[PDB]
Design a protein around this ligand. Structure first.
Ligand SMILES: Nc1ccc(F)cn1
Length: 330
């Protein structure tokens, strides 16, 4: 079997991507954030605290004839941005663009933090990192991909995010028309539960490529590209007026600038992120200072190849016996 669904940016800045997901019987369609950096499938629901719901589509487990409460199971998650959610667990039928999984753990939110409430376009998350990170207690649950894997035509899922445009999440197959050239595969470490790989280096604009090992994760759930301070300083040193701002919380640059591109290595291959992909608009409404899309990972603990980097490529999340990541230009 295979699945194919369109993913859409939530706003004009591509702050996150939403993909329609069918839950329960009859189908309850929720727009979820497909996150290769986490492993919980959680949704806004009829159980979420009323004041914490503001525009989101909710899942009502009582209206699903196939919903079953997982006895004594609870979940609680906290993300890198300081946001969090928690609640109880159901098992139900979940479908992504024609691909179905029965008995998928659907984590129903009783509480969500302010950032989830403030974003009415995101109805929940669909975790695509390794199941070892799933927070369901006392019995850990598997991801949608893990549950579907055996049934797929090929044990893979692909991410094809758009810049200011619609994109695609495919499951069980590789669309050979969605990229140019060849897919270069790279080694993956699953020891931290992430699609963690090593980039072979970088280049700023038309500058010389720097061979250096950058250990990071392929994360669709993170908006920006987080890299070592040395690398981010080299990039922003090419933009006149750019500076690191402690009040704004990162590198800012004059909105009138034309940003240079950023290249990252995948083995002998190169992925070029156009400069426009790194512009995250005014720091505050009406400001002439803009926020940068390439930020330092010094306070994180890990490098994050987020949406900024991934949307410049066709990305294969290969769940074969030994998982690997594939990257191609497009
Ligand atoms: N880096 C993040 C932040 C929030 C979230 F829901 C997922 N990932």
């Amino acid at each position: 079997s295979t699945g194919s669904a369109t993913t859409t940016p939530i706003d004009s800045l591509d702050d996150a991507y939403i993909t329609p997901v069918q839950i329960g019987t009859p189908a309850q369609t929720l727009n979820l954030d497909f996150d290769t950096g986490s492993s919980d499938l959680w949704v806004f629901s009829s159980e979420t605290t009323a004041s914490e719901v503001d525009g989101q589509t909710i899942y009502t487990p009582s209206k699903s004839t196939t919903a079953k409460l997982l006895s004594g199971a609870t979940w609680s998650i906290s993300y890198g941005d300081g946001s969090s959610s928690s609640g109880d667990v159901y098992t139900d039928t979940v479908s992504v663009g024609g691909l179905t999984v029965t008995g998928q753990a659907v984590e129903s939110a009783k509480k969500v933090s302010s950032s989830f409430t403030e974003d009415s376009t995101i109805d929940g998350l669909l975790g695509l990192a390794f199941s070892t990170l799933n927070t369901v207690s006392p019995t850990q649950q598997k991801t949608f991909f893990d549950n579907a894997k055996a049934s797929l035509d090929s044990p893979v899922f692909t991410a094809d995010l758009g810049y200011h445009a619609p994109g695609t999440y495919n499951f069980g197959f590789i669309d050979t028309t969605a990229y140019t050239g060849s897919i270069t595969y790279t080694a993956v470490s699953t020891k931290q539960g992430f699609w963690e790989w090593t980039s072979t280096g970088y280049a700023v604009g038309s500058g010389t490529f720097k061979s250096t090992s950058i250990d990071g994760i392929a994360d669709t759930g993170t908006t920006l590209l987080y890299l070592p301070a040395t690398v981010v300083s080299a990039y922003w040193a090419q933009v006149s007026g750019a500076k690191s701002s402690s009040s704004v919380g990162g590198y800012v640059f004059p909105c009138s600038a034309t940003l240079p591109s950023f290249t990252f290595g995948v083995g002998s291959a190169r992925i070029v992120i156009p400069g426009d992909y790194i512009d995250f608009g005014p720091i505050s409404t009406g400001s002439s200072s803009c926020f940068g899309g390439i930020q330092s990972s010094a306070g994180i603990g890990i490098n994050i190849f987020g949406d900024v980097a991934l949307k410049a490529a066709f990305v294969v999340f290969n769940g074969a016996t030994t998982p690997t990541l594939g990257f191609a230009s497009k």
